[PDB]
Amino acid sequence: MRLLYLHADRFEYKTVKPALKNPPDPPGEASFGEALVVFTTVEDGDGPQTVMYAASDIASHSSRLKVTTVILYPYAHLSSRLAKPMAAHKRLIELEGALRTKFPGHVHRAPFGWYKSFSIACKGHPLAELSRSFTE
Amino acid sequence: MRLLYLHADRFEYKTVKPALKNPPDPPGEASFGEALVVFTTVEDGDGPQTVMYAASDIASHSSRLKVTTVILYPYAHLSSRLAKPMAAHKRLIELEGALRTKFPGHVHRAPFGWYKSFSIACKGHPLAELSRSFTE
Numbered sequence: 619m620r621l622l623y624l625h626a627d628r629f630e631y632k633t634v635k636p637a638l639k640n641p642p643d644p645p646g647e648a649s650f651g652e653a654l655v656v657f658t659t660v661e662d663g664d665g666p667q668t669v670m671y672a673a674s675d676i677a678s679h680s681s682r683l684k685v686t687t688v689i690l691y692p693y694a695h696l697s698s699r700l701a702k703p704m705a706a707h708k709r710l711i712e713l714e715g716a717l718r719t720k721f722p723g724h725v726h727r728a729p730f731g732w733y734k735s736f737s738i739a740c741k742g743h744p745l746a747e748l749s750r751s752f753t754e
Numbered sequence: 755m756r757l758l759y760l761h762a763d764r765f766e767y768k769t770v771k772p773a774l775k776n777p778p779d780p781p782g783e784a785s786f787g788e789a790l791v792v793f794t795t796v797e798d799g800d801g802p803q804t805v806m807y808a809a810s811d812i813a814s815h816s817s818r819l820k821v822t823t824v825i826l827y828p829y830a831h832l833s834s835r836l837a838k839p840m841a842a843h844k845r846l847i848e849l850e851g852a853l854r855t856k857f858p859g860h861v862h863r864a865p866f867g868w869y870k871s872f873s874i875a876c877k878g879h880p881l882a883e884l885s886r887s888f889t890e
């Protein structure tokens with residue numbers, strides 16, 4: 619699993635066209651204030667342990683930034699070893715569930731299987747932008 | 755070299771703290787209207803051929819999107835096989851130079867070696883967000 623952690627002053631997205639024949643989540647849109655935005659690419663090897671490591675690391679990083687909102691943003695583009703879409707959807711649901719057991723703030727998982735427009739204002743401090751890899 | 759192509763309605767950045775002992779570019783800030791924003795991670799193997807392939811592909815993609823502004827945005831976080839900073843700076847300068855021989859619009863290379871805040875509004879059409887790899 620490859621993640622990009624972006625500490626935003628604000629974030630919003632809107633689903634536009636379907637990217638999958640039948641997206642498993644409904645269309646919609648949402649906007650946020652200060653949040654850790656986690657662009658998340660699920661990789662072929664990802665299983666339960668990978669999800670638990672990532673949930674721990676996101677919670678720990680959120681804690682040190684003192685953010686109380688996490689956005690789990692499905693992203694196809696961080697890796698060249700993608701899981702298939704149905705496995706990726708399942709892992710992202712698991713990740714959202716695991717993160718709730720480790721992090722006490724707002725957890726928002728964005729819809730899977732859509733093209734989306736988005737806007738972000740990302741902070742420019744030294745820890746505002748980091749990448750992570752998790753495996754089992 | 756790993757790139758992320760983001761077709762933006764608007765983009766702006768500001769350098770904040772130095773990320774390198776002595777950044778090779780001066781601090782500053784800039785904002786743009788519609789642009790292809792190219793987040794660019796230079797990798798250990800990158801040489802002249804890699805720069806020429808990437809310059810061709812960015813020009814060709816810009817052409818099909820009908821954009822007339824390209825932002826070359828140095829980014830540490832797209833890969834786990836980074837070139838050293840002085841080689842990466844040199845390759846990004848080469849890339850800017852090569853892209854000018856292939857693409858007739860505004861080319862803006864952002865300063866290397868800074869932490870930066872940024873804002874982007876990214877379009878949500880099917881080709882608004884793509885990743886690329888180039889090697890030799």
Ligand SMILES: C[C@@H](O)[C@H](N)C(=O)N[C@H]1[C@@H](O)[C@H](n2cnc3c(N)ncnc32)O[C@@H]1CO
Nearest residue numbers: 637659660692693694701706730731733734
């Ligand atoms: C494209 C851009 O506008 C938007 N942000 C998008 O990337 N959409 C992706 C994810 O929502 C999802 N998806 C499919 N496979 C995966 C995977 N392995 N990991 C994560 N997400 C996946 O399915 C869409 C098809 O690429």
Ligand SMILES: C[C@@H](O)[C@H](N)C(=O)N[C@H]1[C@@H](O)[C@H](n2cnc3c(N)ncnc32)O[C@@H]1CO
Nearest residue numbers: 773795796828829830837842866867869870
């Ligand atoms: C960090 C974030 O706010 C900002 N956007 C940033 O990423 N800054 C990077 C690039 O400007 C540059 N840099 C160093 N090595 C490389 C490399 N191999 N490829 C590209 N850039 C590099 O040096 C800084 C140190 O990571």
Ligand SMILES: [Mg+2]
Nearest residue numbers: 632633646647
């Ligand atoms: Mg809508």
Ligand SMILES: [Mg+2]
Nearest residue numbers: 768769782783
């Ligand atoms: Mg300034």
